[model samples]
Target: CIKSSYAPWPRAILYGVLGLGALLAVFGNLLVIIAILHFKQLHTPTNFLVASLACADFLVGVTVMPFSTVRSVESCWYFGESYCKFHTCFDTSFCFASLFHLCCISIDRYIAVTDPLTYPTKFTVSVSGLCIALSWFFSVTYSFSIFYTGANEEGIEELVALTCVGGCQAPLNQNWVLLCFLLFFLPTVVMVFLYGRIFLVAKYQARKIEGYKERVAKRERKAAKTLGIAMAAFLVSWLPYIIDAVIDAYMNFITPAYVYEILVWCVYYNSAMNPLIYAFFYPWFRKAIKLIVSGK
Candidate 1:
């Protein structure tokens, strides 16, 4: 009988870790989603983007992580080939959708902090909804094409399920590899640029303002810094996986199963970290949590 490759204790430990991570991601992101949707104060465009991000992360927790936990712990695939394909599709689509939402949030913050006067007109509820729709549309199309369109050579043919008899995998073609890297790398660059510009603008405003203007500038700077930390967490979690993919693609150096698993779980762990970051840094999130817990 096919089975896990670890001693019983080690297997149990790893399974526990995966199960806990999945629960944390689900519980944390669900709170973020509920807080944003429930509170009138968080109904702004920026929080709308955050709520969409939480939705993607929530899906990851629900649809992606449970299967992953079973596969990773058992070191086998008993879920059949068809379920594997559906799993791969959602796994890729949800992560890309989450990253795109972060990019949109960065752009939204850039306009809000750098061009505060016109930010409202530029990013109304309708506009934010449009951006969210576009992000999901692009993610679904990209992942479906990769899975169904034979994104490798011999185009126009249906792709086989990415698996061995006992192993589950999502084997990306070269085009998908390049596209995935671009999705991650470009968003990181954009967020860095936007935050840099935001800091510079904040510094200049600090020098020019006094009293009430100074206080407002200070608050804006604080918000920008908080979001900068959030983006940094994303970079820390995702960049290693992106770099590993690039090397595996171009240099033909296959990352070992252990290393690849670690990096991938790191990416998954970021979904859990998002709400923690917000709760630690944003007073509004803390307020929401307090209100939630206190039944007020």
Candidate 2:
């Protein structure tokens, strides 16, 4: 239901906020990528995962944000049938990919600390490739299934097929509930469980290394510290988005529209923060940025 008669001032503000936020996200994540690719000292398995996660968030910000902001402003799928699906698919895919990359990073931390001696073999590049592929696969499989049906006709004051043209609101009903469960809730549960176990393992490893008076133990402890930093960073940045989702899932039913919109924006901003958080803690991301800046 496009609001054909709405005032202009509010629409302008909507465009400005979303457009500005999108630009901030794009520039910030691009810098993160550049920093990582530019430096050599940052190259390692943990940093490797960080770089990949940054790449996912960058795509999510740049590829999905602008058109979405426009849609918010227009309050309609003015781009016609084709772009509607593409818009939904693009947003859904990159978001899922970013989340799955986070899962992979969590798993990597678990391996690095739980069994540092075998981390490399267990998390080979081949396995990384597969995990990335699965993320996109699941994203595409679901978003494409949603198609528009109808909407309340503008100016209609009562029950009727108010308009033939309308976006699918099924996504606002049962479909949305399922999407939240599968994409947001399920992934959050997995990350919390995996990270909790890793915390215990890493705690043990840290103490063991502290007891040893040798360089080998010193190196192990350093690796554990770095892994802890990256894992902790991932949890901090991602947990809020998940919490916001859980809140909004209920708020969508009980709260006002404006309140729901605020929380949704908060979740979108989370994707932007992810790249910054990873680049800050992970060395490989630093190298990548330096490499890009110096033209290497």
Candidate 3:
């Protein structure tokens, strides 16, 4: 009520900027979804996994983010108090999906990197589907652990009532948050282990390529390089928030509202960055766009 009469220009700017982000998030992921499904060549299992990851972000853009802009602009949660828990739960599920799917790809990419000959025989459409199946199942199961254990009711409602006048958040209590730490932690370990090994193998292969006349040999390095960076992007996007959550849970809620929101925003922005990283870094995506936009 204090800032109820706030300046119009600032409100417009804030809403407008976030609106653009949401639009791109939805639109760019739409491109990914259509490209993968529409193109026969790209209908491979790994691409489906990528498409699945894109859907998580697209859903976030559609369902979660648009409202947050209003939340921030008006400095209040416009949605009923009921949706806050539901909303926060929804976000947690998708966040888990990204992590699980991202790790799914880590093993997927690792096989391709370390044992290319074996990868084709080893990881098939069935294998890809299983990774996706596992990723989504694990994501949903853990996310429900929050719901069934009443973590959301305790963590979200209590905190929102006290802290955020018009806010929804990824609720936490030290008790359940320990599990959340494991959620982020194990994937990080898997990703680090596989990616470190991936690049090490990539390095060794690059040396052999130098001695042998490089044909498609150089291509392996590029794939290795882009994918290794992909994990880096997810980690950096998540790290601050992950660290912040760990600190916030342990310290018993010293974080200011705005600062907490900053960490959350970075996590949301990862969805936006996900598209840019893939489409720009990988050539298939450009071919995807050419086929997509040119209406062939």
| Separate clash counts for every candidate | 0, 21, 2
Models 1 onward score TM values of: 0.84, 0.68, 0.85
Model 2 weakest 10-residue run by lDDT: 152-161
Q: Rank the candidates by TM-score, best first.
A: 3, 1, 2
| Per-residue lDDT value at 11 in model 3 | 38
* Clashes by residue pair, model 1: none
Among these predicted structures, which one has the highest lDDT? Answer: 3
**Model 1 clashing-pair count:** 0
Please provide, for model 1 over 1-296, each residue's C-alpha lDDT reduced to its tens digit, 9 standing for 90 to 100. Answer: 35346424533677667788789888877877889878787787777887888888889999888887776655566777667658878877888888888788878878888787877788898879988998999889988887655564332112222323555565454556787777778778888889888777876676666546657766677747765677678888888778787676555445556456667778887877876774435777978877787868
lDDT values of the candidates?
0.73, 0.59, 0.75
Which residue ranges in model 3 land beyond 4 Å of their true spot?
1-13, 152-167, 211-228
| Reference-based TM-score, model 2 | 0.68
Can you give the lDDT of residue 126 in candidate 1?
89
Q: How many clashes (backbone atoms < 3 Å, residues ≥3 apart in a chain or on different chains) does model 2 have?
A: 21
Give all candidate RMSDs, comma-separated.
4.5, 6.4, 3.8
Off by over 4 Å in 1: 1-12, 150-163, 207-228
Residue-wise C-alpha lDDT for candidate 3, range 25-106, written one tens digit per residue: 8998888888887778887767878888899889999998877777666656767767776677677788888878878888
Clashing pairs in model 3? 76-166, 77-166
